[PDB]
Amino acid sequence: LGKLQDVVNQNAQALNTLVKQLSSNFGAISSVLNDILSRLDPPEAEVQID
Amino acid sequence: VGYQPYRVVVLSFELLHAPATVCGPKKSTNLVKNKCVNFNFNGLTGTGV
């Protein structure tokens, strides 16, 4: 069945890519927000978190 | 007692934006399971059962 499978596969792939999007830096120096907070003080790390 | 060769060593410490690469081992705590507990197992500070 194709009409019943695409509506599930597309949703699963979109959720998987939502998971993938947090693995990117978006032009910052780290992906997880905790690393920049632990390694840099919040006054200078406002640009990266923004 | 004032002119013999003494062995003098210096043990300095490094403080930068790095995890504890080398330091005294922390005392092993107690293990809890099936409770919502935070842990740091060498790669992440995650909270969960």
From Swiss-Prot, chain A:
It comes from the Viruses. Residues 5-49 form a coiled coil. Changing residue 38 to A: In strain: Alpha/B.1.1.7. Changing residue 10 to H: In strain: Omicron/BA.1, Omicron/BA.2, Omicron/BA.2.12.1, Omicron/BA.2.75, Omicron/BA.4, Omicron/BA.5, Omicron/BQ.1.1, Omicron/XBB.1.5, Omicron/EG.5.1. Subunit of the fusion protein that is processed upon entry into the host cell. Mediates fusion of the virion and cellular membranes by functioning as a class I viral fusion protein. Contains a viral fusion peptide that is unmasked after S2 cleavage. This cleavage can occur at the cell membrane by host TMPRSS2 or during endocytosis by host CSTL. In either case, this triggers an extensive and irreversible conformational change that leads to fusion of the viral envelope with the cellular cytoplasmic membrane, releasing viral genomic RNA into the host cell cytoplasm. This is Spike protein S2'. The chain holds residues 945 to 994 of 1273 of the full protein.
Curated annotation (Swiss-Prot), chain B:
It comes from the Viruses. Residues 17-39 are annotated as: Disordered. The gene is S. Attaches the virion to the cell membrane by interacting with host receptor, initiating the infection. The major receptor is host ACE2. When S2/S2' has been cleaved, binding to the receptor triggers direct fusion at the cell membrane. When S2/S2' has not been cleaved, binding to the receptor results in internalization of the virus by endocytosis using host TFRC and GRM2 and leading to fusion of the virion membrane with the host endosomal membrane. Alternatively, may use NRP1/NRP2 and integrin as entry receptors. Changing residue 3 to H: In strain: Omicron/BA.1, Omicron/BA.2, Omicron/BA.2.12.1, Omicron/BA.2.75, Omicron/BA.4, Omicron/BA.5, Omicron/BQ.1.1, Omicron/XBB.1.5, Omicron/EG.5.1. It comes from Severe acute respiratory syndrome coronavirus 2 (2019-nCoV). This is Spike protein S1. Binds to host ACE2. RBD also interacts with the N-linked glycan on 'Asn-90' of ACE2. Cleavage of S generates a polybasic C-terminal sequence on S1 that binds to host Neuropilin-1 (NRP1) and Neuropilin-2 (NRP2) receptors. Interacts with host integrin alpha-5/beta-1 (ITGA5:ITGB1) and with ACE2 in complex with integrin alpha-5/beta-1 (ITGA5:ITGB1). May interact via cytoplasmic c-terminus with M protein. May interact (via N-terminus) with host bilirubin and biliverdin, thereby preventing antibody binding to the SARS-CoV-2 spike NTD via an allosteric mechanism.
